[PDB]
């Protein structure tokens, strides 16, 4: 498992509130911020742990909802929900879980969203 | 004339940056911040001056766009439209709602003002980028 995280930071945003939103869901992520033109910016991170995510889908009873969005895999989490510690699917936090050559993404999907 | 302004502040936004985006377009606005749910908030305020807005439309040379947007949101004694919050942050006027909500603007004409005259005054027609009346 390798998790690729990307989040944009608009001029009116607090880069660190965005960072916190990410970590709330992927606490293990190694994140770096890239500056851009006209006050825009972005966070690019990576992590190998989907534990907090799993813990939230369960603790929030949305395993099936997640299962559906997941079916490597890429999806978007709602930044504002992630900020208050919640997992939500409806730019957002770009997430891409990619199973190494010797794994099946589906099996990863079932371990994450039973 | 009277301008009503409302701008949401999302959880990951810095309320002071949203407030400055408003002031960059409406310098005289009196603003108040109210808290909502799940870390959301909102700025509300008013001003009787559209002087800065008028300068920016001329400076950016986007009178033609402004005129169309103002007429489209026009009613009997008012007109409304949104401003891009990110463009506003850097001192620019843009009418597309940004990913974060934009700034909702309502210009109200008083009983002795004609709303269409307010609009012609703010965003006058042009012929070659040069104002008419």
Residue numbers in the entry:
A (entry chain C): 2 to 72, 79 to 97, 102 to 125
B (entry chain A): 2 to 134
What does the report in the manuscript say about this coordinate set?
The protomeric structure consists of a five-stranded, anti-parallel β-sheet, five α helices, which are located on one face of the β-sheet, and three loops connecting helices and strands.
For 10077a from M. jannaschii, full-length constructs with either N- or C-terminal His6 affinity tags failed to yield crystals. C-terminal truncation of 30 amino acids yielded diffraction quality crystals and a structure. The polypeptide chains of 10077a and 10077b extend beyond the C-terminal helix, α5, for about 20 residues, and form a type IV turn followed by random coil. Pairwise sequence identities among the structures we report herein range between 15–22%, with exception of 10077a and 10077b, which are 35% identical. Our four UPF0201 structures represent subfamilies N149845 (10077a, b) and N130963 (10077c, d). The crystallographic asymmetric units contain one protomer in 10077c, two in 10077b and four protomers in both 10077a and 10077d. While 10077a, 10077b and 10077d all form one type of dimer (typeI), 10077c forms altogether different dimer via crystallographic symmetry (typeII). The interface surface area for type I dimers in 10077a, 10077b and 10077d are 672, 563 and 611 Å2, respectively. In type I the turn connecting β1 and helix α2 (residues Thr13-Asp15) assemble closely to form a two stranded β-sheet. Interestingly, structure alignment shows residues (Thr13, Glu14, Asp15, and Lys18 of 10077a) near the interface of type I assembly are strictly conserved while those seen at the type II assembly are not.
